Design an enzyme around this catalytic site. Sequence first.
Site, PDB file in Angstrom:
ATOM      1  CD  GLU A  51      42.461  57.973  75.050  1.00  0.00           C
ATOM      2  OE1 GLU A  51      42.496  58.993  75.417  1.00  0.00           O
ATOM      3  OE2 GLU A  51      42.021  56.882  75.687  1.00  0.00           O
ATOM      4  CB  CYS A  93      37.377  56.518  73.541  1.00  0.00           C
ATOM      5  SG  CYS A  93      38.708  56.145  74.434  1.00  0.00           S
ATOM      6  CE1 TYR A 125      45.464  49.082  80.167  1.00  0.00           C
ATOM      7  CE2 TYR A 125      47.643  49.972  81.279  1.00  0.00           C
ATOM      8  CZ  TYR A 125      46.745  48.948  80.320  1.00  0.00           C
ATOM      9  OH  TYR A 125      47.479  47.592  79.859  1.00  0.00           O
ATOM     10  CB  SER A 126      40.859  55.981  79.233  1.00  0.00           C
ATOM     11  OG  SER A 126      41.319  55.698  77.908  1.00  0.00           O
ATOM     12  CE1 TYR A 166      42.166  50.721  73.836  1.00  0.00           C
ATOM     13  CE2 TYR A 166      41.625  53.287  74.106  1.00  0.00           C
ATOM     14  CZ  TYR A 166      41.290  51.999  74.232  1.00  0.00           C
ATOM     15  OH  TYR A 166      40.163  51.931  75.181  1.00  0.00           O
TER      16      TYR A 166
HETATM   17  C1  LIG Z   1      45.536  56.385  75.246  1.00  0.00           C
HETATM   18  C2  LIG Z   1      45.459  55.057  75.544  1.00  0.00           C
HETATM   19  C3  LIG Z   1      44.332  54.696  76.376  1.00  0.00           C
HETATM   20  C4  LIG Z   1      44.245  53.326  76.472  1.00  0.00           C
HETATM   21  N1  LIG Z   1      43.236  53.100  77.436  1.00  0.00           N
HETATM   22  C5  LIG Z   1      42.950  51.766  77.753  1.00  0.00           C
HETATM   23  C6  LIG Z   1      41.879  51.428  78.710  1.00  0.00           C
HETATM   24  O1  LIG Z   1      41.010  52.285  79.122  1.00  0.00           O
HETATM   25  N2  LIG Z   1      41.600  50.164  78.783  1.00  0.00           N
HETATM   26  C7  LIG Z   1      42.205  49.279  78.158  1.00  0.00           C
HETATM   27  O2  LIG Z   1      42.110  48.086  78.497  1.00  0.00           O
HETATM   28  N3  LIG Z   1      43.299  49.304  77.399  1.00  0.00           N
HETATM   29  C8  LIG Z   1      43.573  50.670  76.896  1.00  0.00           C
HETATM   30  N4  LIG Z   1      44.526  51.060  76.042  1.00  0.00           N
HETATM   31  C9  LIG Z   1      45.373  49.792  75.655  1.00  0.00           C
HETATM   32  C10 LIG Z   1      46.474  49.528  76.579  1.00  0.00           C
HETATM   33  O3  LIG Z   1      47.390  50.598  76.769  1.00  0.00           O
HETATM   34  C11 LIG Z   1      47.676  48.339  76.306  1.00  0.00           C
HETATM   35  O4  LIG Z   1      47.925  48.597  75.214  1.00  0.00           O
HETATM   36  C12 LIG Z   1      46.653  46.823  76.300  1.00  0.00           C
HETATM   37  O5  LIG Z   1      46.230  46.971  77.833  1.00  0.00           O
HETATM   38  C13 LIG Z   1      47.686  45.750  76.296  1.00  0.00           C
HETATM   39  O6  LIG Z   1      48.544  45.841  76.911  1.00  0.00           O
HETATM   40  P1  LIG Z   1      49.237  44.480  77.216  1.00  0.00           P
HETATM   41  O7  LIG Z   1      50.442  44.857  78.000  1.00  0.00           O
HETATM   42  O8  LIG Z   1      47.966  43.838  77.811  1.00  0.00           O
HETATM   43  O9  LIG Z   1      49.761  43.894  76.076  1.00  0.00           O
HETATM   44  P2  LIG Z   1      51.161  43.637  75.222  1.00  0.00           P
HETATM   45  O10 LIG Z   1      51.732  42.412  76.065  1.00  0.00           O
HETATM   46  O11 LIG Z   1      51.844  44.915  75.093  1.00  0.00           O
HETATM   47  O12 LIG Z   1      50.850  42.977  73.966  1.00  0.00           O
HETATM   48  C14 LIG Z   1      50.475  44.210  72.957  1.00  0.00           C
HETATM   49  C15 LIG Z   1      50.633  43.420  71.670  1.00  0.00           C
HETATM   50  O13 LIG Z   1      50.032  42.326  71.153  1.00  0.00           O
HETATM   51  C16 LIG Z   1      49.407  42.763  69.841  1.00  0.00           C
HETATM   52  N5  LIG Z   1      48.087  42.686  69.647  1.00  0.00           N
HETATM   53  C17 LIG Z   1      47.025  43.464  70.099  1.00  0.00           C
HETATM   54  N6  LIG Z   1      45.836  42.997  69.899  1.00  0.00           N
HETATM   55  C18 LIG Z   1      46.027  41.523  69.356  1.00  0.00           C
HETATM   56  C19 LIG Z   1      45.215  40.626  68.662  1.00  0.00           C
HETATM   57  N7  LIG Z   1      43.818  40.424  69.084  1.00  0.00           N
HETATM   58  N8  LIG Z   1      45.780  39.964  67.639  1.00  0.00           N
HETATM   59  C20 LIG Z   1      46.863  39.975  67.403  1.00  0.00           C
HETATM   60  N9  LIG Z   1      47.819  40.670  68.211  1.00  0.00           N
HETATM   61  C21 LIG Z   1      47.495  41.455  68.926  1.00  0.00           C
HETATM   62  C22 LIG Z   1      50.688  43.764  69.112  1.00  0.00           C
HETATM   63  O14 LIG Z   1      51.846  43.238  69.090  1.00  0.00           O
HETATM   64  C23 LIG Z   1      50.703  44.787  70.607  1.00  0.00           C
HETATM   65  O15 LIG Z   1      51.812  45.478  70.219  1.00  0.00           O
HETATM   66  C24 LIG Z   1      44.939  52.348  75.937  1.00  0.00           C
HETATM   67  C25 LIG Z   1      45.957  52.772  75.098  1.00  0.00           C
HETATM   68  C26 LIG Z   1      46.403  54.137  74.770  1.00  0.00           C
HETATM   69  C27 LIG Z   1      47.361  54.303  73.829  1.00  0.00           C
END
Ligand SMILES: Cc1cc2nc3c(=O)[nH]c(=O)nc-3n(C[C@H](O)[C@H](O)[C@H](O)COP(=O)(O)OP(=O)(O)OC[C@H]3O[C@@H](n4cnc5c(N)ncnc54)[C@H](O)[C@@H]3O)c2cc1C
Length: 295
Positions: free
Chosen positions: A293, A253, A71-72, A295
């Site tokens: 950046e 971003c 997370y950023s 994602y």
């Molecule tokens: C460098 C970086 C910075 C980030 N910064 C932030 C930030 O500041 N704030 C923030 O909220 N997030 C940020 N993210 C994204 C964050 O890391 C997580 O990916 C996101 O919060 C979702 O994680 P989760 O555990 O909630 O979902 P998970 O349970 O891990 O589910 C993710 C999976 O669901 C699927 N998916 C995603 N979107 C959809 C959709 N609408 N339709 C279909 N399938 C989908 C894919 O299979 C994905 O792999 C960042 C990512 C990176 C790489």
Amino acid sequence: DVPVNLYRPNAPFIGKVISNEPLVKEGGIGIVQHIKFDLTGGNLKYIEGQSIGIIPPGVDKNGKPEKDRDYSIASTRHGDDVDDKTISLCVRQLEYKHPESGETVYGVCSTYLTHIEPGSEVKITGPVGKEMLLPDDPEANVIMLATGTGIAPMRTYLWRMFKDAERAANPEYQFKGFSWLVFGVPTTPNILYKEELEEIQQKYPDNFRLTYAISREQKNPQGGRMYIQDRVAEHADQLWQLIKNQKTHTYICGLRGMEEGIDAALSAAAAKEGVTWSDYQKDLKKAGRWHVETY
Ligand SMILES: Cc1cc2nc3c(=O)[nH]c(=O)nc-3n(C[C@H](O)[C@H](O)[C@H](O)COP(=O)(O)OP(=O)(O)OC[C@H]3O[C@@H](n4cnc5c(N)ncnc54)[C@H](O)[C@@H]3O)c2cc1C
């Protein structure tokens, strides 16, 4: 000089939640939370533009421990209280379709974070990242192109540039350049940190410009919903003229997908002066002046 991986997944820092506030106002779409963590009792330090990891509890569908998510960082190095004691995140609850088995699917780490209570302990890793850093040069121009939670690193920049307490705490960085945020969200209630951004533009009209692309409230000239690439197209000449300066940095971003339209718009602007943007851009990237950046 830059702090990096002071904590790692095998031995994370256990921080405590201080606060968890909503950023989407009434009538907005989805859930976005500003979450502040207590860093006291560890040596996690960080700077603007970096990220940290959160390790959520539980096992996945295969019985394996849930892994780190990035997370950023949404606070400056000093934290929101300018005390060097905290760190903040800007977290969206991921939820989506039935085309993944079920009804609404809820992201593991984002749902954990958005619903977490003050006083709860959290596993934090990092900080990470060197490709979204702000120049030390106070006379730099800074273009910020953000959608949704991509506002997070931009908040760290703008707060360092423009908050009274930050200016008082940072003798060596008294920003006098020009920054311009183009920010795309679906609704006005979805404008994260709206009041404070508009406050900053009011105080610093020559140093900060704020441009919104609000898809449910505005139409582009072709009649479709207004997105950030539409605003970059509308202002492509202005943005290219700024990008030509040796001291200009651009930051992008958000969720992946914005870059293609941003490039087509800048490509058309540069082409008028006999420049191919894709080549100019590779050089900007090499110089460390094109930061992305997504994602
Ligand atoms: C460098 C970086 C910075 C980030 N910064 C932030 C930030 O500041 N704030 C923030 O909220 N997030 C940020 N993210 C994204 C964050 O890391 C997580 O990916 C996101 O919060 C979702 O994680 P989760 O555990 O909630 O979902 P998970 O349970 O891990 O589910 C993710 C999976 O669901 C699927 N998916 C995603 N979107 C959809 C959709 N609408 N339709 C279909 N399938 C989908 C894919 O299979 C994905 O792999 C960042 C990512 C990176 C790489």
